[PDB]
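Sample 1 of the test manifest.
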Amino acid sequence: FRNNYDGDTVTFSPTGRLFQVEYALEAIKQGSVTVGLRSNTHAVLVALKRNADELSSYQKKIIKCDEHMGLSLAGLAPDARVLSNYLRQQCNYSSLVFNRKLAVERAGHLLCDKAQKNTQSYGGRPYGVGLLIIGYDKSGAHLLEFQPSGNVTELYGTAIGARSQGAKTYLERTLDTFIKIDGNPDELIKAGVEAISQSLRDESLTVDNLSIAIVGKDTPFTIYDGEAVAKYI
Amino acid sequence: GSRRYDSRTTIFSPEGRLYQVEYALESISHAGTAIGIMASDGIVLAAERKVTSTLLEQDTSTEKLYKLNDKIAVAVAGLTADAEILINTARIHAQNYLKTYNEDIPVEILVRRLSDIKQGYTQHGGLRPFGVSFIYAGYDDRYGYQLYTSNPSGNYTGWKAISVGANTSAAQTLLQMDYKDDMKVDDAIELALKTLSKTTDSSALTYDRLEFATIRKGANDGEVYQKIFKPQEIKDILVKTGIT
Amino acid sequence: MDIILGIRVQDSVILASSKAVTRGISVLKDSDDKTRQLSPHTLMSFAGEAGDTVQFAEYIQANIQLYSIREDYELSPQAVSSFVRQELAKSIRSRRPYQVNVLIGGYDKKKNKPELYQIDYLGTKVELPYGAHGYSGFYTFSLLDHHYRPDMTTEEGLDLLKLCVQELEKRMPMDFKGVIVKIVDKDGIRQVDDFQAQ
Amino acid sequence: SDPSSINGGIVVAMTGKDCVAIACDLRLGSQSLGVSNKFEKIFHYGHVFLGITGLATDVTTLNEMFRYKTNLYKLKEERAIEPETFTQLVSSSLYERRFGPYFVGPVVAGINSKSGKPFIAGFDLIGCIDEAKDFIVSGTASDQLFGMCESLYEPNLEPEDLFETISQALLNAADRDALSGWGAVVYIIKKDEVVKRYLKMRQD
Amino acid sequence: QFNPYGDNGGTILGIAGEDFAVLAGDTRNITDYSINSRYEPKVFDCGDNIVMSANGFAADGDALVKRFKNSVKWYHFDHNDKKLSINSAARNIQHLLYGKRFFPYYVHTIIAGLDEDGKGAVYSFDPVGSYEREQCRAGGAAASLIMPFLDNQVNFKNQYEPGTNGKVKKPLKYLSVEEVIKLVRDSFTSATERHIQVGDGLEILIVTKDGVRKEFYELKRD
Amino acid sequence: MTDRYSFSLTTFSPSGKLGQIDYALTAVKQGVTSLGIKATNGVVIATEKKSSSPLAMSETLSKVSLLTPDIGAVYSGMGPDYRVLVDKSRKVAHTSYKRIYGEYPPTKLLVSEVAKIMQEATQSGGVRPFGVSLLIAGHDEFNGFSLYQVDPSGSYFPWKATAIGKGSVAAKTFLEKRWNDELELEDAIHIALLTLKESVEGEFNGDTIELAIIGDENPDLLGYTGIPTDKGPRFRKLTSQEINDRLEAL
Amino acid sequence: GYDRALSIFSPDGHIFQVEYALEAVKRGTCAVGVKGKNCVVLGCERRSTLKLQDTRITPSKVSKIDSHVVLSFSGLNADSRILIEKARVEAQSHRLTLEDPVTVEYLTRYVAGVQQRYTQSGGVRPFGVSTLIAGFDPRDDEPKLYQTEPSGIYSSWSAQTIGRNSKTVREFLEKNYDRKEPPATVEECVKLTVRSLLEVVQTGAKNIEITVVKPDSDIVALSSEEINQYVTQIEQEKQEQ
Amino acid sequence: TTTLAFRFQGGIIVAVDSRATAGNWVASQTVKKVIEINPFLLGTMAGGAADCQFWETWLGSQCRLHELREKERISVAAASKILSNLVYQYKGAGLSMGTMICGYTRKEGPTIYYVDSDGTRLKGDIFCVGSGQTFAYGVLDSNYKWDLSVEDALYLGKRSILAAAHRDAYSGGSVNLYHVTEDGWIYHGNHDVGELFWKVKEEEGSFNNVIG
Amino acid sequence: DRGVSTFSPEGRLFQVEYSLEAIKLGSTAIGIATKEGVVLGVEKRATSPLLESDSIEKIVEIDRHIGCAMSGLTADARSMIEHARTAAVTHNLYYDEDINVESLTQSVCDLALRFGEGASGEERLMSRPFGVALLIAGHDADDGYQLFHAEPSGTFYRYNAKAIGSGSEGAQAELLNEWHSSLTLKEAELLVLKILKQVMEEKLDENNAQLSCITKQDGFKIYDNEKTAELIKELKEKEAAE
Ligand SMILES: [Mg+2]
Ligand SMILES: [Mg+2]
């Protein structure tokens, strides 16, 4: 069984499964937790950063792609770099060649197409990281969830990483509330923090521990880390 | 995938040996015996042919002794086709050296180059080696008479008398027995023949089963002559020696 | 052009080559050695385009040195030359041909005879009693055609070169600043430190 | 600049009664400056002869190239190449560089060892093959040579006589050309033997 | 044959003060004898307190300016939001320029800003990269007219101290933004009087620790 | 995508055998019998036309192929493998010979060329040896008449006569008695016909036998007149009728 | 096209093909190099699969990379040929561009890197060779001895050996070589090298070949006889007891 | 342009002028024509501004890399041949540069190499390079002597540039002096021709083809 | 067999884990980062007394402001260092300034996962992960003194102190205790020296342990045997009390 059909991404199991892709998805579940949630005016990202020792830094999980887009990563960081870098290039191309801010919807479509090549090609390997993408554009705020399988989905909010299910359910209830947090950045953030706290167990989210990012109407994708997230615990 | 069907022809055993090389050598040991004996005024190359019949035309045949250039020749033990590939390229490297330097190519250089082509198949590319071993008989202004040998591992060495193919240990032992530093061409021929005679996996050593070659620097001339013996002449040299 | 003369005596080859490098309106150096030792018994003299000159020389040097080591042997002069010719003949049809002219003077230790080869940037090679490249030959060949004898001594050849130099200093328009002479014989290669006044 | 006129030189060959002859001059210069008095232009691969006029570096290159090709030919075919065949090899080797030719004008002379018939031929720098029963001329003095041959020549001359003919043809044609001369050599070719004679001529 | 190049006139001038620097440029854009635009800016804010202008063949100037802003964008990305100091921007441009050494950006560029110490700085480039830091520099068509003026009025060349038998140079003081702007305006009106490519408008970009301020003055439109 | 099979598919076994090659020789063994006998003034190669159904049209399949106007080849083993070898062999006779020397290549050289291809299929990455053995017969001004056999390993050897495939051994044995060095072509044809008969299981006539010869020059087959050096092709495929006339003299 | 990863990691952190290459090294004849106070000696034992050789021609074990640097090895003979040539070229190239011959270290670092490279490039197996490279840096008199292995690792030694039974001879060196007084002479260094070789070569004059490298391009291979003299005098510094 | 460097008892002197021209247009008079590679290596520039600045700043990099790689400081010979071989690769493309690589190393001692875009690399004791080279040589050659004092050397190199700055339209601005010793290069100032000429005339009593 | 870029059922890259194992067998390397500099010390680990200890390069300079210590199959690090050096020099060329240590480090880690056999993602030309890990320490003006641990997985973390190699878990644990914001360069030298002593099989002395530091004032300095020996001595006394 499995041991015969999991050797590579160019093999389908007898059930119609792609194990290498599936195995890829697992490194995500192993990663720390991050949450995304958008109102109609802003989109926030709150992600729990994970240290290695009490003597180390907390792996940076959010990346700015353009002044209007960014994402939080969950899983294999390198693959995150490779992917955000690609997102950076496509954003650049739209600005340069069309003087148009790239549509998050399109950014999504592009990421899916990139991952998919490493899920039907020999010797290649699926990406091992999930991504939460937020952005404000010509049609308001957005939040996109990307999976190495190549699947990308736009949601009012969501969470990924270990214990993600906590926050994912939390938001699923908190919806009617946060989606109405228009014109009040700090609140959405709060909502985000609360949500993120729903997938905790270790210790309470701290200064070196938390990472939040916000994008919106008159707010360029800005990264808040440590000293500045204090007011959000 | 494709890796599935890859034999990895250039890998090491846990013992630090090269499978494909070791296995090629084995192939070669089932091949007709070839011998090279170096004299003080010549070199003899003799070979025993494998695959014979009443109908095989021996006249217009040359399956074991090949001319590389006017001063060097080789005797082959292995796959005859793999042989021709290496020969055609060795012949060429000879001519290149010539054009470039206007001097005939030193036997060892030619040899070393050929050995280098073989070592390649040993270290990269993923292809099976050539199942061939060579005994080169050549002359040159820097070392005169030379006899070398090369095999699938791309290693080469020089010899006073040597053999390759089937029954090497037997022949080698016989050669170590009757060979002496100050031999002469007409004598080495005899030795060459005798040796073949006692290692042959057949009944009697007949002319049609042999290929003989000599590289003599005749005194009344100056140019190193290469003579690849013709059937009638093998028969003759054979009677002289008494094998009949 | 710069001066490159070579004359093969009975037991040696003497190459004479000008000490000046001029660029535009100024003589930049008055002590250039337009020569490279290809091997202990083979010296090559060169002249032509500004950079191609040394670049081609040193390249040929490297290649001959390498062969020397790979085989622990010294290629015959004739060999070194045929090699040089082919490098040239291949260059002439490249994108940017080496515009270099060379004289190769070597002592063939096997034949125990000095040799001198003249090769132009097109890979035109010829073996000669004496040769030159540039405009110098226009004077020296006739001078030598008259004063040269096959059985001359190293000393006689040097004096013959002296005549050549003098004729050149008399009639050529450019001040080439004298020459550096080098003799290639059985015991190697040595530079006549005494030619500016012999 | 005209590649074919830098070095100077001539070659000519004629056929006789069971013989052929090919000769040439020994000059090699650089425009006005004579540089070498010993530059032969006739070469041979076994019993086949090739004379090459034109740019010296190319003459040299082509010689080396046909030694190679003929050497390998013998190793593969186990016999020496014939004229009729070498000609084709020359032609094709030349056409191979159709748009960046070797500036040369080869001449082939020999006697078929199988048929014994005399054979000679010339080519333009890109391979046109001119097989003639009479003579073939080439070099800087080609016009002059054509003049000599066309008049002096007559069918079926004996070796001894042909030698005269070819010699006078060369000699005289060379003297009316500034770029040729400085020595001459003639090859008389017969099945059995071939004799090479040097000629005494104006050294100007 | 197709001629890949053109000349769009214009003239630019940059002056570095003690705690500021300006980069002014005219606003006209022409072609041969026709005016393409009376208002087409060529001095831009590139972020990080750096203003730049690449005057000459507008297509090239534009391409250059584009590639640099972008270089600033990626400097932030690749080097964790670090601010590109002017000296670094300069060297970066040298490379942008010299990359096209065999099909040059037919432009004379200048950037202004504050150095690492906060003092004013101006840097100017040859179309293939030669660059240097300077007190002031003009570029473009009327460069030859304006430059001498600045050597005199900004660097006080040839001006000596009265009654010293010409043995003591005028004290090399540093102008205020107000004076600098006066000079910029004069240099430009003058240039407009005599050059047919200069005119229509003047846009100056002033650079201080407080950011980048824009000033605009009208010029003759004939 | 892309042929990533860049490694040899024929390697060495611990007994020193090249599996794929031996196997190809087996495939050959399963193939119909074909033979070639060499005369003093000719050579004949023949084989049987294993009509794989009576609905199929025998003539529309040449198992005997002309390589040059003086060379032919017949085989035993996998036909397709053969057909493509003829194509190549016919091409190489031009590219490596007629386009350089202005004359067709000599038997041994052409053979030498064919052989080299087969060898490559024994070592090149990603392929399997050819499942054929061929008998190539020709003539050339300098070597006279010849007959060669080329195996999947790429080895070739000249023969006075031989047979390959199914009834090889029996046939090889039958030839050894009849053959001698004073055979005039007609007699060898005859012998070939006899030899062939014994391998042939059922029908035996010109519609089931493909026999070709390499003999005298045939100007009526040149197609043009006026040039006295090109005397005509020496290879001739025998007609059904011509075979029967010799069959009716069993 | 052929790009299969042959040297790869196995569950325990080993690169088998690299390790298996070390074995082929162990299977090769011994080679020793010990450095004196003004020299470096490199000795090697001789193979014995068959005998009736032509001592004159057969490529010895010690090779000159340049007029002042030598390299001996233990391993696949053929494999060593490639490293030598590659080393020689770089020896020339370096001369051409730096106008100075290589230091033994440079040459070492070069050869070393080539080995490492083959342990992580597709389509190739590591070099089944280990080398001893010795000589003197241009214009310096301090002897240099370095060793390289198929992994690509390298470093220097006062004395060292590689090849079959190197474990045994290493011990002899470890005991007989004092870093406070390296064999202060060409003679005693040669001796110590022979003594060491003897412990395993097992009394065989024609079984040993020694080479000495002195400063400024002075490299000399001893005669079958001069060594035999060392073997003789050495069997006495064991017999007189 | 106008640059010189010459060898002597106390080391090497490198003096260059500082004018940049666009044809007859004086583009600048404040250009540094000497690039300080490492504490013991100076490279002078003449020809295309960019070509020199660019490839010499680059040279500086390749020199540093060598340090990192070999732990030893790059020789002047090697440093120079890098530029030279580089330039030779671009031969025929239009690079325009004439430069001198001066420096001191324990191995070579004081050393100066001239390398130009034609690929000529030469070692020597005195080189003047640039449109004003002849002017510099004139003055330099006539007063140069090996046993010169460091102070006199400085002055001489200085003076020679002065010379060229005066006569050669294409040279001027100010002279930049450098002294290369056993312990490295020592900068000896930037001297404005605007004032240097007058001082020199009065003190030395030369340039009498001028009144003032 | 299976490819070199295959994911285990636990979501990890085999070859990466495996190389990480090979790294566990290396000589210890410890780096501690203080407000006065960063110390990087390593254990030479001579495999024989005839090997000239000083010929062991496990601490290298990337640039005057960046140094680095390796641990693992040290031959694999050569191409990494080279890239590190070129990356820093090149940066100085294109921007006339020093490369940020993070940046340098990040550039090195970009090589990490570039292994494969035709992995449709770019052109990955390396057959297997690096079998070594690095401790990269340096200083820039923006973020002060920094120490980074770079693994063959492409990830790298910043540590106030870190140990890699054989004695990692033990040493790491010790570091964890001993470390504090207000440490001093000498204290750090000591800890490295002390902790090295502990995890080292043979007895730590000047010929088998190597110390180095990088400071704003003097840059990357590899401590000379004599200086380190003095510290070793200063340690026997600090330890030979209480
Ligand atoms: Mg005349
Ligand atoms: Mg108007």
